Amino acid sequence: PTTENLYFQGSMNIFEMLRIDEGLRLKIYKDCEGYYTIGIGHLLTKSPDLNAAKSELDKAIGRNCNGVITKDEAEKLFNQDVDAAVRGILRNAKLKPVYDSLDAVRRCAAINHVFQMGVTGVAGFTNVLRMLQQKRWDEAAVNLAKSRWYNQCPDRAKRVITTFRTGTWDAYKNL
Ligand SMILES: OCCn1cccn1
Numbered sequence: 001p002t003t004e005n006l007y008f009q010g011s012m013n014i015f016e017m018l019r020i021d022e023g024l025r026l027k028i029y030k031d032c033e034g035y036y037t038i039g040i041g042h043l044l045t046k047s048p049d050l051n052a053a054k055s056e057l058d059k060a061i062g063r064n065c066n067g068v069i070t071k072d073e074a075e076k077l078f079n080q081d082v083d084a085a086v087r088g089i090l091r092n093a094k095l096k097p098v099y100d101s102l103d104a105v106r107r108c109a110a111i112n113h114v115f116q117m118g119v120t121g122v123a124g125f126t127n128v129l130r131m132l133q134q135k136r137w138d139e140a141a142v143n144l145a146k147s148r149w150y151n152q153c154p155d156r157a158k159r160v161i162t163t164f165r166t167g168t169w170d171a172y173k174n175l
Pocket of ligand 1: 089095096098099109110111113114122129132
């Protein structure tokens with residue numbers, strides 16, 4: 001690895017990771033599962049009603065947005081959502097021990113997974129959690145690749161799975 005290559009891991013963190021997996025959109029759009037989303041992976045509602053999405057948006061941002069936000073607002077909402085995912089892991093009796101056992105890079109993958117699926121969804125992956133705690137990385141990655149989360153929307157999940165396998169940031173290189 002070059003001097004520049006060795007600096008790459010210092011440029012990656014949970015924010016940069018999710019920013020790549022979720023993208024950045026300033027107008028309401030439907031994600032790969034058909035759910036109204038905005039910003040950096042902020043799911044507004046699972047309701048099919050765009051008015052519901054707009055109502056949630058205005059609530060979240062605090063002004064009359066009419067379905068559009070600024071980059072600064074996207075970033076603030078993103079930081080709030082990341083904090084929520086971390087807090088959700090740390091207070092959960094099943095996820096905290098697994099998270100604590102992980103290295104720094106896999107901890108980011110854990111937060112990313114919770115950001116995407118929510119706490120109960122992730123806490124339901126009983127086998128994967130045991131595999132991770134036992135450092136069975138290849139088995140964990142194969143099992144994640146069986147999930148509906150990954151299979152219904154592979155591009156948003158693939159990088160996370162690779163990161164659980166390797167504990168490096170390589171899947172986020174060379175976009
Ligand atoms: O995403 C599976 C790993 N994980 C552990 C705690 C939260 N997530």
